[PDB]
Amino acid sequence: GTGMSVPEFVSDLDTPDPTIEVFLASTSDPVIPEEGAQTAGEAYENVDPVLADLTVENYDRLLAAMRSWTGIPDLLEDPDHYQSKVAINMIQMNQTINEEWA
Amino acid sequence: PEYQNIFTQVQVQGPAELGVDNENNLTEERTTGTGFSQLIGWIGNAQLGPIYLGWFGIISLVTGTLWFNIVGFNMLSQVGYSIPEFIRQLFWLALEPPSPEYGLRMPPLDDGGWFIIASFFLLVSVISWWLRTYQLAEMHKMGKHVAWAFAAAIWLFLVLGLFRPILMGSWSEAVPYGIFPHLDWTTAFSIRYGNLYYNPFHALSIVFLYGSVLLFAMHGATILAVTRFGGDRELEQIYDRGTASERAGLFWRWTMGFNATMEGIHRWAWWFAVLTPITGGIGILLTGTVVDNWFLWAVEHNFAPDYTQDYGYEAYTTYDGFLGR
Amino acid sequence: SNSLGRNCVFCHNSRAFYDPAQHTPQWATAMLGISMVQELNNEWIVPIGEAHLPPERLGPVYNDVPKLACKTCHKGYQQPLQGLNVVADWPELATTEGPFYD
Amino acid sequence: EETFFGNFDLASLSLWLFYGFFALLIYYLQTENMREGYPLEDEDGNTAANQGPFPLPKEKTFKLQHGRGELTLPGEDVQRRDNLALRKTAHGNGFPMEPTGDPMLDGVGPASWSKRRDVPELDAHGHPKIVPMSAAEGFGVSAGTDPRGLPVMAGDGEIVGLVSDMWIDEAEQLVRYLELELDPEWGDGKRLVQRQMVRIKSDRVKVRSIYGKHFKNVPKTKSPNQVTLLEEDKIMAYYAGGTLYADESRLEPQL
Amino acid sequence: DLSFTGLTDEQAQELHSVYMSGLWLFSAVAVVAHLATFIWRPWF
Amino acid sequence: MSKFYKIWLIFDPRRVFVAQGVFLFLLAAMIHLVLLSTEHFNWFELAAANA
Amino acid sequence: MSKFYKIWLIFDPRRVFVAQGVFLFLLAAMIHLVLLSTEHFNWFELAAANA
Amino acid sequence: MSKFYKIWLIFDPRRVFVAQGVFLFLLAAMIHLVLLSTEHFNWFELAAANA
Amino acid sequence: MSKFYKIWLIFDPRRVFVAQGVFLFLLAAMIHLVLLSTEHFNWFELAAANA
Amino acid sequence: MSKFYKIWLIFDPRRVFVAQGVFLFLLAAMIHLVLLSTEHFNWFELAAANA
Amino acid sequence: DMTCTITCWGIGVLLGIMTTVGLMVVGWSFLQGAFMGVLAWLIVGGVLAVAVCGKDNAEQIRAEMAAARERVRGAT
Amino acid sequence: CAIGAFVSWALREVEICRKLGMGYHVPFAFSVAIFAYVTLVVFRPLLMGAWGHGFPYGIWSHLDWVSNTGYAYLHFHYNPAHMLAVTFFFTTTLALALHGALVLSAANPPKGEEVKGPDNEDTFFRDFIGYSIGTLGIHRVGLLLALNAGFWSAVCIIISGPVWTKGWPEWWNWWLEMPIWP
Numbered sequence A: 001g002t003g004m005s006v007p008e009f010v011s012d013l014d015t016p017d018p019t020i021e022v023f024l025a026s027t028s029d030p031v032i033p034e035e036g037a038q039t040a041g042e043a044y045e046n047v048d049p050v051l052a053d054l055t056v057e058n059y060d061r062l063l064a065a066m067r068s069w070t071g072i073p074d075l076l077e078d079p080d081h082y083q084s085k086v087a088i089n090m091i092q093m094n095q096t097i098n099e100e101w102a
Numbered sequence B: 001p002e003y004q005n006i007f008t009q010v011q012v013q014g015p016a017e018l019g020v021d022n023e024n025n026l027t028e029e030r031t032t033g034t035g036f037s038q039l040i041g042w043i044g045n046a047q048l049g050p051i052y053l054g055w056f057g058i059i060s061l062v063t064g065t066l067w068f069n070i071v072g073f074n075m076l077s078q079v080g081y082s083i084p085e086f087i088r089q090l091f092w093l094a095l096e097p098p099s100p101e102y103g104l105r106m107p108p109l110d111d112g113g114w115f116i117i118a119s120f121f122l123l124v125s126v127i128s129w130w131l132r133t134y135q136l137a138e139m140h141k142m143g144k145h146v147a148w149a150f151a152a153a154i155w156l157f158l159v160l161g162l163f164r165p166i167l168m169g170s171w172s173e174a175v176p177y178g179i180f181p182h183l184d185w186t187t188a189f190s191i192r193y194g195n196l197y198y199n200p201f202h203a204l205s206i207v208f209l210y211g212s213v214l215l216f217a218m219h220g221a222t223i224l225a226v227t228r229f230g231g232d233r234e235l236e237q238i239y240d241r242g243t244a245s246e247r248a249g250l251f252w253r254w255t256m257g258f259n260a261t262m263e264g265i266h267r268w269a270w271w272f273a274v275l276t277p278i279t280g281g282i283g284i285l286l287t288g289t290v291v292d293n294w295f296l297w298a299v300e301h302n303f304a305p306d307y308t309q310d311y312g313y314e315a316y317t318t319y320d321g322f323l324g325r
Numbered sequence C: 001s002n003s004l005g006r007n008c009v010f011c012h013n014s015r016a017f018y019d020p021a022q023h024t025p026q027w028a029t030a031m032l033g034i035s036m037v038q039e040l041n042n043e044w045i046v047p048i049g050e051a052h053l054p055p056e057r058l059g060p061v062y063n064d065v066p067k068l069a070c071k072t073c074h075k076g077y078q079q080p081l082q083g084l085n086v087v088a089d090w091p092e093l094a095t096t097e098g099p100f101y102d
Numbered sequence D: 001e002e003t004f005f006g007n008f009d010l011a012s013l014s015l016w017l018f019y020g021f022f023a024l025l026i027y028y029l030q031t032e033n034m035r036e037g038y039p040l041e042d043e044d045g046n047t048a049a050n051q052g053p054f055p056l057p058k059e060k061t062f063k064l065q066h067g068r069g070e071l072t073l074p075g076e077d078v079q080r081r082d083n084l085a086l087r088k089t090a091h092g093n094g095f096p097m098e099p100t101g102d103p104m105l106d107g108v109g110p111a112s113w114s115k116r117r118d119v120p121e122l123d124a125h126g127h128p129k130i131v132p133m134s135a136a137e138g139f140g141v142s143a144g145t146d147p148r149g150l151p152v153m154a155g156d157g158e159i160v161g162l163v164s165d166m167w168i169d170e171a172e173q174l175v176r177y178l179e180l181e182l183d184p185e186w187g188d189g190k191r192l193v194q195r196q197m198v199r200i201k202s203d204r205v206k207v208r209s210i211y212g213k214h215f216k217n218v219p220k221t222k223s224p225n226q227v228t229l230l231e232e233d234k235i236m237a238y239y240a241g242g243t244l245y246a247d248e249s250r251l252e253p254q255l
Numbered sequence E: 001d002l003s004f005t006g007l008t009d010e011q012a013q014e015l016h017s018v019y020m021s022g023l024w025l026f027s028a029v030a031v032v033a034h035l036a037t038f039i040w041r042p043w044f
Numbered sequence F, G, H, I, J: 001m002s003k004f005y006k007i008w009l010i011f012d013p014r015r016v017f018v019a020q021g022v023f024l025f026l027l028a029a030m031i032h033l034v035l036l037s038t039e040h041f042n043w044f045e046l047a048a049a050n051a
Numbered sequence K: 001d002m003t004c005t006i007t008c009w010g011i012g013v014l015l016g017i018m019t020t021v022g023l024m025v026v027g028w029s030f031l032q033g034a035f036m037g038v039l040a041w042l043i044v045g046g047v048l049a050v051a052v053c054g055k056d057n058a059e060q061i062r063a064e065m066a067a068a069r070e071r072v073r074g075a076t
Numbered sequence L: 001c002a003i004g005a006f007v008s009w010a011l012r013e014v015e016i017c018r019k020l021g022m023g024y025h026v027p028f029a030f031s032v033a034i035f036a037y038v039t040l041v042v043f044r045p046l047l048m049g050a051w052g053h054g055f056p057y058g059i060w061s062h063l064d065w066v067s068n069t070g071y072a073y074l075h076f077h078y079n080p081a082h083m084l085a086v087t088f089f090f091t092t093t094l095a096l097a098l099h100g101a102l103v104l105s106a107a108n109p110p111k112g113e114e115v116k117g118p119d120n121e122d123t124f125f126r127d128f129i130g131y132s133i134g135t136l137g138i139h140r141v142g143l144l145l146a147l148n149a150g151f152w153s154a155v156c157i158i159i160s161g162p163v164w165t166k167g168w169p170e171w172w173n174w175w176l177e178m179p180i181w182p
């Protein structure tokens, strides 16, 4: 009797957000670190936030993900481009969003 | 079926009527020149003109055109003198009342000074049209019912624009001059002071508005059903009762147990219509000055309903179940 | 309402917009989101961009740094990506401390 | 803002004052509408025991134009019919009445007329208000189909005569009556039809209320140039009564 | 509008005959059209 | 019965012919559109497919 | 046939001539617009694609 | 063909003249705008792209 | 072509003159506005561009 | 062209003059406003920026 | 001649329906095409009920009426 | 029960009209109000798929329904058919006030004066505003205005649910992005 309800067409309810499928085609399962695995900092010259990560996790995070989610094909290749400097901050901001705003 | 009397079958035209006169010499100020429209004549009269020009009407027309042009030119200048954009956003533009920080003092022309100058010209125009409506009855030797009915609406007009801002202490309480902007004012006024549904005088105004529309459906329909007995000649039916009045009264007497007379139904109509702005203005004048939250007032005076069930969509369904997943 | 694709009676009973006893449970999470947006704009998004962003990303008037709000992530949907679990496969973006692969 | 006592504040005082005013206004409005038809009577013409909860109003006077006099209301019923051919179908109250002879000729039921003044209605200059078009200087058909010269068809499908003239209200510029000349087979003379009871088509003019055999008994005006209010009421009521009395199937249940 | 007020007997035989002459013409044309359509794209 | 001409004495040819014409045109147009709404019988899409 | 000319003894030449003109132009415009709404039979796009 | 001149015995020349003028101007305007709505036949853009 | 002067045996000159006076100005204004809505032929923007 | 004075034998002088005055004032006002709506030809803004 | 006026208003209604469908083929949406269709109806159908229905029939009657209006003036 | 009662009331008015020999305008006018109520409790609910979309039967609880149903489309004032319906309501009340005032002023002159006729009423209104509809036209116009008010009200509610889902301001976008605009 209140009139409190939300109306929607059923052709619209059956149409998913069209980017859900793009995500599922760019995602992979984590690789569990082994005993004394070699990290990314002992294989290249990188930045502190992404340095204690392993080589395989470095590979999936960087290319398979960050360079496809933001369509920047050469992200984090030159350590002096402004895009790398802002992406390093965006990594920490994305971590704090998930950690302190649960 | 039988003829229903909504459109005239055949029209007849003769010499134009120039009007009645008496010792007050109304002819001296009437314009000469009339026209005829056969499109309108399918429903009502076809003659157009003439009109009476006194000083009250001329002053009202001049000062109302001034108000219109101050608003229109301010709206045009707000957009950069771009005519196509002026047309594109016509329904969205307005001349805004002053800011609350200025109180009842005179604000800068950019922040409400033109609004106050234009409001003074609209005031003058409206009061002049009312003095014309009173003078013409006096000159025609008739009653003053039209002027009183007009003053009833002028009461709410003045309450909205003049009285309440003064009692509240700010010119910022007035209504903006716009199409959409004035409707946003209505919604914001209702939201700011609780819920205007729970203002009892708002409910009374709604009662009388509903009653006035129900009565023109009933009166218009009743008069059109007795036009085969000469029922549209109401004044002679008042002066000499005929069968049309008797049948019209007996229909409603047999329907709902009581009826009216030919003269007395117009008093009913006059009062219901007049009572809408009076109760509305009394309701508006009490807001902010006395009562600040009408829903809390209703809770205090015990006519606010209570509900037992819960709030939330997940008390009734699931997000996945609403999508078909 | 236009950012979530919902209406007013979602999170409100319109007879009393002020009364905390007549709100739905979504009102509280929206209240949390207001503070999260205010913190993200003032602490993370504006400070970077005033230091690295090129002149061609600074908006028409005031040379403003672009900012975010509720629709930057929802996109006219009730939940972002309609509630896809996007953080289970990426433990590296879930915490500020070392990635927990347990 | 403060309260006078309990929860009573300025809004409550205003509301109760309006309640009292509205009660007085309802009393005034109901009393003003009782200037015709009272006191109440029973089905035998005697004054009824019950007269209702409201008393009758005091008197008002109307000063009429053209030297017609004064009218004081409430007063005696001057429009009352004298000898009605009607019969009671029950001994008490609340049951219908039956006509004694011909209902259409006796002016009872839907054919009833009221005894109005036996003079024509006047306009502002003191002249009769409704005039035949053949004597109205300057008037002509400006729109629609002109019905003059067309044959007239009755409700049962018979041609009874031809339209000869139209009677118009010159002050309001409106057609009020159509004048019909009858064929010798269906009567003699001329009759009138009010405009609201005809349908004018391209080749005919249709009157559905009455049949052909009823066209000779339509009341006739005394003068060929003017019609009084009483004649108007008797002519209009005659046509109105045919909607119920023309055929026996119009009076029985339609089911 | 009825001014003819009824047809006669001999004013109807000729009518029927001419009306029948058009109906048969329209139907022959429709039959050929349907045959060609069936030859082009059958539905049975 | 052998000659059915006796049906036009209870009718007026004018309105019968008008109604006939309107009915024929409307039914033909609706059949054509219904065929156009079908995948297999839409001849405009078939030319594009035979290209 | 040979008696179709008697159609003008029932129908008015002036009413038939205005109605037929309106119907014919409306049908021609409708058919041209239906052709313009396709892919294979839109000559304005065909001219652009060819050249 | 040699007797089409009798069309003026049924149609009032004034009415047909007014109607034909309005029809012709409206048709010309519609065709010009339809040409303006395309890409290959827009002469305002071709001048821009050829200079 | 030498008998066109008879057009005034059919049309009232006053109505024709009024209609033509309205039509010519409306068409001229429409064309002058159509030119201003493009980039190449807008003379107000071109003057600022070359300053 | 030496006989253009005959327009006064068709149109009444009184009406034509009123329409001409109204038309001319409205056109002049529209053109002045159109000039005011630009950046290059707004002389108030030019005077503001040149000092 | 009220029957020619109604015909002229109906040709306007029909032109309006055609204006909507034509703008939609060219790229406009329904409501955008229907506002333009309503104006085509009202402007054109109105214009034709004044101009075409005002060329009323009269033949030498038209002539004399006009030649006599040309006699009212001359002494007015 | 309410639907049955309303239909029986209309059919009783029809019989009273038939007995008195009058026209059938009043039952036809009442049919419009019946149509606005059946749209609110039967037509919109059936289209939307549940009887729970009707308004409740309570003096102060059927206003809560109205409030919540309008904010479910964000800003209800921007509904195009609601704007037409409100205009019709206000115009009927202004015309009823004018008609009642004119008749009463004609029948009740100042003390010591004679009564007035229709000529005087026609004249006052042409002097006041330059036009007079007449004694017969005013009733036709009042009836038409009232019936148009109730029909447009029914339309405003039946499009709000089953035809439109978004806010009503957004519906105006067709005007704001018309291709003619620069």
Ligand code: BCL
Pocket: B126, B153, B154, B156, B157, B186, B187, B189, B190, B195, B196, B197, B201, B202, B205, B206, B209, B276, B277, B279, B280, B281, B283, B284, L066, L090
């Ligand atoms: C969110 C919206 C709020 C709301 C907010 C308001 C506000 C705010 C107000 C109304 C008011 C009213 N509301 Mg409410 N109202 C709501 C919901 C409703 C609903 C419903 C849901 O069905 C209804 C039926 C109504 C109806 C009404 C009316 C009964 C009343 C106006 C009275 C009147 O006389 O109007 C007719 C209008 C007038 C008489 C104005 C006067 C006009 C003057 C005289 C014009 C002068 C001439 C002019 C300047 C010249 C023009 C140019 C000429 C062409 C020359 N409201 C909700 C709760 N309502 C008003 C009232 O009185 O409140 C109690 C008011 O101020």
Ligand SMILES: CC[C@H]1c2cc3[nH]c4c(c3C)C(=O)[C@H](C(=O)OC)c4c3nc(cc4[nH]c(cc(n2)[C@@H]1C)c(C(C)=O)c4C)[C@@H](C)[C@@H]3CCC(=O)OC/C=C(/C)CCC[C@H](C)CCC[C@H](C)CCCC(C)C
Pocket: B033, B034, B035, B036, B037, B038, B040, B048, B049, B050, B051, B061, L129, L130, L131
């Ligand atoms: C709420 C009621 C509204 C109203 C209604 C109203 N006024 C009207 C009319 C109507 C319906 C007319 O038809 C009549 C008129 O002719 O307007 C152009 C008029 C009028 N109301 C006027 C005044 C007026 N009305 C006012 C108020 C109002 N009147 C309200 C807005 C006011 C103010 C400010 O309150 C004013 C000052 C004048 C503009 C005009 C007075 C009539 C007059 O002077 O007529 C002279 C005669 C003529 C020759 C002009 C007629 C035009 C044609 C050349 C005639 C041929 C007719 C043609 C076939 C159709 C065109 C007519 C159209 C109106 C349909």
Ligand SMILES: CC[C@H]1c2cc3[nH]c4c(c3C)C(=O)[C@H](C(=O)OC)c4c3nc(cc4[nH]c(cc(n2)[C@@H]1C)c(C(C)=O)c4C)[C@@H](C)[C@@H]3CCC(=O)OC/C=C(\C)CCC[C@H](C)CCC[C@H](C)CCCC(C)C
Pocket: B060, B061, B062, B063, B064, B065, B068, B125, B126, B129, B133, B146, B149, B150, B152, B153, B273, B274, B276, B277, L090, L091, L093, L094, L097, L098, L129
């Ligand atoms: C009892 C309450 C109801 C009511 C009654 C009422 N209204 C009234 C009256 C009465 C009894 C009058 O006597 C008076 C009147 O003149 O009525 C014909 C009037 C009136 N009520 C009006 C408006 C109005 N009333 C409203 C409300 C109501 N009035 C209630 C429903 C409403 C709303 C918001 O619902 C409005 C908008 C006016 C039509 C009129 C008051 C006339 C007046 O004061 O005019 C001042 C004039 C000017 C602004 C100067 C003219 C400048 C114009 C901007 C342009 C030129 C005029 C031109 C004629 C208009 C444009 C048309 C063009 C084609 C020329």
Ligand SMILES: CC[C@H]1c2cc3[nH]c4c(c3C)C(=O)[C@H](C(=O)OC)c4c3nc(cc4[nH]c(cc(n2)[C@@H]1C)c(C(C)=O)c4C)[C@@H](C)[C@@H]3CCC(=O)OC/C=C(\C)CCC[C@H](C)CCC[C@H](C)CCCC(C)C
Pocket: B210, B213, B214, B217, B218, B221, B255, B256, L001, L002, L005, L006, L009, L026, L027, L029, L030, L032, L033, L056, L057, L058, L059, L062, L146, L147, L149, L150
């Ligand atoms: C253009 C349409 C307008 C209109 C027309 C109209 N109504 C009419 C008429 C006409 C022409 C009559 O002739 C007729 C009449 O007799 O009037 C005296 C009537 C009428 N319209 C009425 C009222 C009315 N009209 C309204 C409005 C309108 N009616 C419109 C403005 C409104 C509102 C809300 O604005 C109301 C309340 C009645 C007074 C009357 C006759 C109805 C009637 O008596 O019906 C018989 C039924 C009963 C006596 C009781 C029925 C009981 C039910 C079985 C139970 C109740 C359930 C109900 C749904 C509960 C609601 C609770 C609320 C708090 C929500």
Ligand SMILES: COC1=C(OC)C(=O)C(C/C=C(\C)CC/C=C(\C)CC/C=C(\C)CC/C=C(\C)CC/C=C(\C)CC/C=C(\C)CC/C=C(/C)CC/C=C(\C)CC/C=C(\C)CCC=C(C)C)=C(C)C1=O
Pocket: B215, B218, B219, B220, B222, B223, B245, B248, B249, B250, B252, B253, B256, B257, B258, B259, B260, B261, B262, B265, B268
């Ligand atoms: C010029 O022209 C005109 C007139 O005129 C000259 C007019 O006037 C009017 C009319 C206008 C007015 C008078 C103005 C005021 C009107 C209004 C403001 C309109 C608003 C009206 C109301 C608020 C009141 C309306 C009342 C209604 C709708 C309900 C009334 C109905 C009943 C009480 C019951 C109906 C009775 C029926 C159906 C018959 C009984 C049924 C039976 C089976 C009979 C069997 C017997 C019994 C069961 C036992 C006894 C029954 C009894 C006593 C009946 C009562 C029932 C009870 C339950 C007690 C107009 C318009 C007009 O333009």
Ligand SMILES: CCCCCCCC/C=C\CCCCCCCC(=O)O[C@H](COC(=O)CCCCCCCCCCCCCCCCC)COP(=O)(O)OC[C@@H](O)CO
Pocket: B200, B201, B203, B204, B207, B301, B303, D005, D006, D007, D008, D009, D011, D012, D013, D015, D019, D020, D022, D023, D024, D026, D027
């Ligand atoms: C000759 C014949 C005369 C006939 C005419 C008489 C008409 C008016 C006469 C009497 C009305 C008296 C009714 C009063 C009862 C309620 C009391 C009241 O108003 O209470 C208010 C509460 O406000 C409301 O409840 C809102 C009222 C809405 C407005 C009208 C509704 C009609 C809507 C619908 C109609 C349906 C029912 C209709 C029924 C008619 C009902 C009037 C606050 O209380 P308070 O007393 O102010 O508080 C101070 C205290 O606390 C101190 O301590």
Ligand SMILES: CCCCCCCC/C=C\CCCCCCCC(=O)O[C@H](COC(=O)CCCCCCCCCCCCCCCCC)COP(=O)(O)OC[C@@H](O)CO
Pocket: B207, B256, B257, B258, B259, D018, D019, D022, D030, D034, D051, D052, D053, D054
């Ligand atoms: C509380 C009581 C009612 C029950 C509660 C539920 C219903 C509430 C709704 C409406 C009530 C209307 C009831 C009317 C029924 C009348 C029955 C009837 O027929 O009663 C007559 C007596 O009545 C009359 O003469 C008419 C009475 C007025 C009509 C209603 C007015 C509605 C005005 C305004 C709108 C109202 C909204 C409120 C504004 C709140 C304001 C604060 C007997 O016959 P009579 O011969 O005429 O006697 C008289 C004379 O002649 C003597 O001789």
Ligand SMILES: CCCCCCCC/C=C\CCCCCCCC(=O)O[C@H](COC(=O)CCCCCCCCCCCCCCCCC)COP(=O)(O)OC[C@@H](O)CO
Pocket: B257, D050, D051, D052, D053
């Ligand atoms: C059939 C099923 C019914 C449907 C069930 C639904 C329930 C609700 C429906 C209807 C209720 C109305 C019932 C009442 C009708 C009574 C019948 C009637 O009226 O019967 C008459 C008898 O009179 C009476 O019984 C008088 C009634 C007095 C009315 C009160 C006046 C004000 C009232 C209101 C003011 C309103 C203001 C605000 C209000 C708040 C404030 C009240 C026979 O008359 P009679 O023999 O011809 O002559 C005699 C005549 O003159 C007068 O005695």
Ligand SMILES: CCCCCCCC/C=C\CCCCCCCC(=O)O[C@H](COC(=O)CCCCCCCCCCCCCCCCC)COP(=O)(O)OC[C@@H](O)CO
Pocket: D049, D050, D051, D052, D053
């Ligand atoms: C707050 C609102 C409350 C609800 C609404 C009722 C109040 C509104 C006002 C009036 C209602 C109508 C009552 C008065 C009219 C009735 C008719 C009448 O009086 O009839 C008389 C017979 O009666 C009497 O002799 C008076 C005794 C009346 C007692 C009943 C009281 C009813 C009280 C209440 C209703 C039912 C209670 C039972 C259920 C419980 C609650 C659910 C016949 O004589 P007569 O021929 O008329 O006399 C001629 C005379 O007229 C000459 O002038």
Ligand SMILES: COC(C)(C)C(=O)C/C=C(\C)CC/C=C(\C)CC/C=C(\C)CCCC/C(C)=C/CCC(C)CC/C=C(/C)CCC=C(C)C
Pocket: E014, E015, E018, E019, E020, E021, E022, E023, E026, F020, F024, F030, F031, F034, G003, G004, G005, G006, G007, G009, G010
């Ligand atoms: C699949 O589902 C759907 C719904 C889509 C369907 O398709 C359903 C389809 C059906 C149910 C279809 C049903 C179809 C019919 C019943 C069709 C019937 C058709 C006719 C009877 C047609 C009649 C046509 C008549 C014609 C063309 C007559 C012509 C006559 C003349 C040219 C002669 C008249 C002229 C003259 C001169 C008369 C002489 C005059 C004189 C004065 C002597």
Ligand SMILES: COC(C)(C)C(=O)C/C=C(\C)CC/C=C(\C)CC/C=C(\C)CCCC/C(C)=C\CCC(C)CC/C=C(\C)CCC=C(C)C
Pocket: B068, B069, B070, B071, B072, B073, B076, B116, B119, B120, B122, B123, B157, B158, B159, B160, B161, B162, B175, B176, B177, B178, B179, B182
């Ligand atoms: C530029 O183009 C031209 C020239 C054609 C124009 O002129 C165009 C003009 C327009 C396009 C104009 C458009 C105008 C509107 C859209 C106007 C809308 C107006 C309203 C909705 C107005 C509402 C006004 C008032 C209301 C709602 C209530 C009350 C008001 C008042 C009582 C006002 C009276 C003010 C007083 C008494 C204060 C005066 C101050 C003093 C100190 C005495």
Ligand SMILES: [Fe+3]
Pocket: B219, B223, B234, L103
């Ligand atoms: Fe009336």
